Amino acid sequence: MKYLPQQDPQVFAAIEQERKRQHAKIELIASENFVSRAVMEAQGSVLTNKYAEGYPGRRAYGGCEYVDIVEELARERAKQLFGAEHANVQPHSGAQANMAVYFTVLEHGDTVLGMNLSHGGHLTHGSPVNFSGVQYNFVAYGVDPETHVIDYDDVREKARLHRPKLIVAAASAYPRIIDFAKFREIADEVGAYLMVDMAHIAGLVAAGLHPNPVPYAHFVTTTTHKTLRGPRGGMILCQEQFAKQIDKAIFPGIQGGPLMHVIAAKAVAFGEALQDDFKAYAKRVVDNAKRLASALQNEGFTLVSGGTDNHLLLVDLRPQQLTGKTAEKVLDEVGITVNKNTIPYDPESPFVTSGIRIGTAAVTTRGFGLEEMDEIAAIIGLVLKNVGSEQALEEARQRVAALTD
Amino acid sequence: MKYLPQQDPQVFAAIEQERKRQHAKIELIASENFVSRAVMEAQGSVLTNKYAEGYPGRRAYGGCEYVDIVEELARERAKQLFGAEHANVQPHSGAQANMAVYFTVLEHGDTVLGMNLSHGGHLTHGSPVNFSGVQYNFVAYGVDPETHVIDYDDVREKARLHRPKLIVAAASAYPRIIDFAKFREIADEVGAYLMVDMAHIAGLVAAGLHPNPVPYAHFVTTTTHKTLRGPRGGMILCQEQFAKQIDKAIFPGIQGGPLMHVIAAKAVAFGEALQDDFKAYAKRVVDNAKRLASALQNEGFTLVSGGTDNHLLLVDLRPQQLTGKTAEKVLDEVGITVNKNTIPYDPESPFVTSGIRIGTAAVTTRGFGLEEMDEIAAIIGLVLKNVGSEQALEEARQRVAALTD
Numbered sequence: 001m002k003y004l005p006q007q008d009p010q011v012f013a014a015i016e017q018e019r020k021r022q023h024a025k026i027e028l029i030a031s032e033n034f035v036s037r038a039v040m041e042a043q044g045s046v047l048t049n050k051y052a053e054g055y056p057g058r059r060a061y062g063g064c065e066y067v068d069i070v071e072e073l074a075r076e077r078a079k080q081l082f083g084a085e086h087a088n089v090q091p092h093s094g095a096q097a098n099m100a101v102y103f104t105v106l107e108h109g110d111t112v113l114g115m116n117l118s119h120g121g122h123l124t125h126g127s128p129v130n131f132s133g134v135q136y137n138f139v140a141y142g143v144d145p146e147t148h149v150i151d152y153d154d155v156r157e158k159a160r161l162h163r164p165k166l167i168v169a170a171a172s173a174y175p176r177i178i179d180f181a182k183f184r185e186i187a188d189e190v191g192a193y194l195m196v197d198m199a200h201i202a203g204l205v206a207a208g209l210h211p212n213p214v215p216y217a218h219f220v221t222t223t224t225h226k227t228l229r230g231p232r233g234g235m236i237l238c239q240e241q242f243a244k245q246i247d248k249a250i251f252p253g254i255q256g257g258p259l260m261h262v263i264a265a266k267a268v269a270f271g272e273a274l275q276d277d278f279k280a281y282a283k284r285v286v287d288n289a290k291r292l293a294s295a296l297q298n299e300g301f302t303l304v305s306g307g308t309d310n311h312l313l314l315v316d317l318r319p320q321q322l323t324g325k326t327a328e329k330v331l332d333e334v335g336i337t338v339n340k341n342t343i344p345y346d347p348e349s350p351f352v353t354s355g356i357r358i359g360t361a362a363v364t365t366r367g368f369g370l371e372e373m374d375e376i377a378a379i380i381g382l383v384l385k386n387v388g389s390e391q392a393l394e395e396a397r398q399r400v401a402a403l404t405d
Numbered sequence: 406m407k408y409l410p411q412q413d414p415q416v417f418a419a420i421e422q423e424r425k426r427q428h429a430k431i432e433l434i435a436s437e438n439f440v441s442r443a444v445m446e447a448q449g450s451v452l453t454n455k456y457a458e459g460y461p462g463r464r465a466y467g468g469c470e471y472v473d474i475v476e477e478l479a480r481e482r483a484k485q486l487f488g489a490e491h492a493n494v495q496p497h498s499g500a501q502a503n504m505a506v507y508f509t510v511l512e513h514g515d516t517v518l519g520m521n522l523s524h525g526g527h528l529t530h531g532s533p534v535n536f537s538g539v540q541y542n543f544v545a546y547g548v549d550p551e552t553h554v555i556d557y558d559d560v561r562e563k564a565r566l567h568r569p570k571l572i573v574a575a576a577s578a579y580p581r582i583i584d585f586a587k588f589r590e591i592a593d594e595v596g597a598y599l600m601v602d603m604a605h606i607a608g609l610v611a612a613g614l615h616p617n618p619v620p621y622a623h624f625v626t627t628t629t630h631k632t633l634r635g636p637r638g639g640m641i642l643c644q645e646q647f648a649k650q651i652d653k654a655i656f657p658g659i660q661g662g663p664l665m666h667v668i669a670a671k672a673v674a675f676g677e678a679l680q681d682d683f684k685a686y687a688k689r690v691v692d693n694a695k696r697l698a699s700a701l702q703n704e705g706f707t708l709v710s711g712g713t714d715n716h717l718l719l720v721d722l723r724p725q726q727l728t729g730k731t732a733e734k735v736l737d738e739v740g741i742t743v744n745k746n747t748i749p750y751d752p753e754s755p756f757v758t759s760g761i762r763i764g765t766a767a768v769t770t771r772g773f774g775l776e777e778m779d780e781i782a783a784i785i786g787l788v789l790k791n792v793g794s795e796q797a798l799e800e801a802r803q804r805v806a807a808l809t810d
Binding site: 002003006007010011017018025027029031033034035036040042046060061062066067092094095096103108123127130131135225248252255257261271328 | 406408423427430436438443448450451466504532658662669673676677743
């Protein structure tokens, strides 16, 4: 940076703190990642100066010839990456991507079926304090109490009873592979649309390590950040038959001018995802998650679902008589970043929880491998089994510093 | 740029085209501006990697100590700039800022009073193809057919008849000062909330060249781009009594994680707006708009409202028997960027129009003064009075190139 340090010392100091924090800490929040310098450069470009309401070739304003190329690059790369018939790369976030699909196919007060929020569902999948739960009548399906795997008979029974106009599949904290074929089968039975929110698993889908929802879903929503490792923003994929309605839902429906500099960064991230090395990265993410899960079990930890098929895992802390809140706090003291997370059928409130969520996408990006996963799990074991020992926590602190150099 | 040219030649080429386009053209779209290199650097920072759902000190995730400083800087600078009791700097756009206020005080189907969209009102102020017109019952007030100034007796009659829960003031294409005291007086009479969308005039408000809506409005929404000359995004200002409800409306209400890198850039832009030189810039914007208006009248053009009090003007093209669409297209041929715009009581559709909208914020940023305003108006006169002459258009083309160096 050249001009920010001189223009704004205060803002620069805080950014520089954050930059060093990102390097110093072990980042295990399952939604986090680190973008390439190219993606950031695209976001720091002059494309922020351009109003481009509408779509390529069909803009509200003139002068869009070049931002049109950028958007088409993003859309075409997205389509190549996921095999979708249509992409909309304008959503400001995952929340707005979801909002636009709901705006497309639902009327106010319509019944929608989503994943239980305390079982892995997202805030935008029916929370009563979110627009989704306020605007629509959300009903929930759950996971099995023993396996913590989605109960597809419960998805089917809830769909046949409540008759939703839309079924939402996918999750913020579900460590196993989702069966989109079964979701579509249930959707076809009750005449519902199927929406898959692949935000968390999107990068694994692109690399062929998770089944692709695109062939089975009417709509697929995602973030461009998370496993996809792009800029912060949203995206909608759908078939050609909904393309017009989906585009209209984004603009003039729920948004105005798009962030062309972020869309530029989306294109960059998609270009990166199309390369062979991203496929190798993504396998290491899943391999690392598996290793970390296995190593945590070796430390004596119980995991939700008994392991993981993807990038994330959930530790059920009940056997150690710890809340997720306590675990989160003590790990923060040693330089390991997790978030407390509700486990299925949690006796605790979402503000306390009986679990922590852990993901490997971020540490894999910085080059952590299987040996690092063993060490992280060993440090977590040391911390959580000795919460009242400052010597144990100092040792953990030093072992975290050893991993981050 | 260092890494983007190597990583992504295609995206780099398009950005580099856009960068050169921005310099080569005369940008008169009233919503456009050019941000500082510091603002862009803040947007191109590592803060895109941080999830920060919630608010400073009250976050959903740990590790937010430094992004908290950034957000508080933005909020405090915003509060200092506009004298507001509370700021929310998380809205992804102007559309989302508006959406959150509607989500705060209105139920589905509630009556809302806004400015006629063909008289200057914004898409999010009740368009039937926008969430606002679909979710709420929007009624409109108009401007006087002779003066094109807001008819405050019509605002009052529409409010007393329809009994809106909310009154929206402010505009996308209104060249005169808005009387917020009269809006609040009408709001108080019918027991309605008052929301002011100051997106276009926000930079003029900060520099004391437009009356501040903050003391009169329950809620003030704005973009951080446009006259404020910041990054692309939204903001909400309100009194302390709505602070909690407004924050809840943004998250967990309508958004998820905020764009901390954009919020960093918001802080930078606010820091710039607090400086003396921005006040001098903003006066030149209004002075230039006045001069341009006057010079256009000297060329024989009729202006909506007979001139301007702010950054923008509207040319009523009817006396030249031209549509706004035709004018927009021919000016594009010579390197002058305008947008067609509906004029009050326009006989043409919004896709054709009888006017063009012109603003000076962008050309003033690049250092255009009063002499440049005279020349721009002379070139516009040359173009629009000789639409069928390729020699006139080539001369215009060369005179545009002379202005942009």
